[PDB]
Design a protein around this ligand. Sequence first.
Ligand code: BEF
Ligand code: BEF
Ligand SMILES: [Mg+2]
Ligand SMILES: [Mg+2]
Lengths: 120, 121
Amino acid sequence: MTNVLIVEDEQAIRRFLRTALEGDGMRVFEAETLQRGLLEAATRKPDLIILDLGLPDGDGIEFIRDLRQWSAVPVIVLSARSEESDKIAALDAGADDYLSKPFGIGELQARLRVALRRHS
Amino acid sequence: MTNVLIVEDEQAIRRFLRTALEGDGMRVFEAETLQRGLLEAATRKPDLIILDLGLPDGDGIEFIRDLRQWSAVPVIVLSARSEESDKIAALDAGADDYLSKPFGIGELQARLRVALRRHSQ
Ligand code: BEF
Ligand code: BEF
Ligand SMILES: [Mg+2]
Ligand SMILES: [Mg+2]
């Protein structure tokens, strides 16, 4: 199946994304820390990762920088941080796309499709 | 020879981009109509296109639908149409990214970089 990993500390976000994604026909995995995010990324072979930056054990930008040393999987940042400067940093570190919260599930899922067509 | 095509009808935006994109050492080519745009895409062989949507000779979403039949060049739309369905439409048409005006140039440049790195692969 099309595998998606969500790295987000807040269940309400993770339930909401899963539902929408499982509704669109994707298998979904989860992680609620940065550290557990990296392990799941290396074990579940996700085709796409949705990343949150405000995580309790570190900033997700360190996740993107770790990840990109060993993986080229698409990464969409979904975060409360809305500064232009936050977006620039995360894209340059290696994220592929960035949506601030609050967001529209519709826009997400479409950007999800963009990221899944180009790399695969 | 990293080549950007800007297809945008208001001049001020076009030279705002050129000032920005020429500053990182790229080559920039302008088009003010959808027709002269589609054309430049097929001809100048650019590495990316920044695509306006509100054009005099038709809708940018048709620029994409058409393009995707003969080019795979990354497309980033830059348009004032700030609507969710507008974004979904353009993306589903084969746009790679979408930034609404008004916009920060820094973020447009970082998103341009994503499209270069992902398509050189
Ligand atoms: F905590 Be995440 F960056 F919204
Ligand atoms: F005219 Be563009 F869509 F801003
Ligand atoms: Mg968080
Ligand atoms: Mg216009």
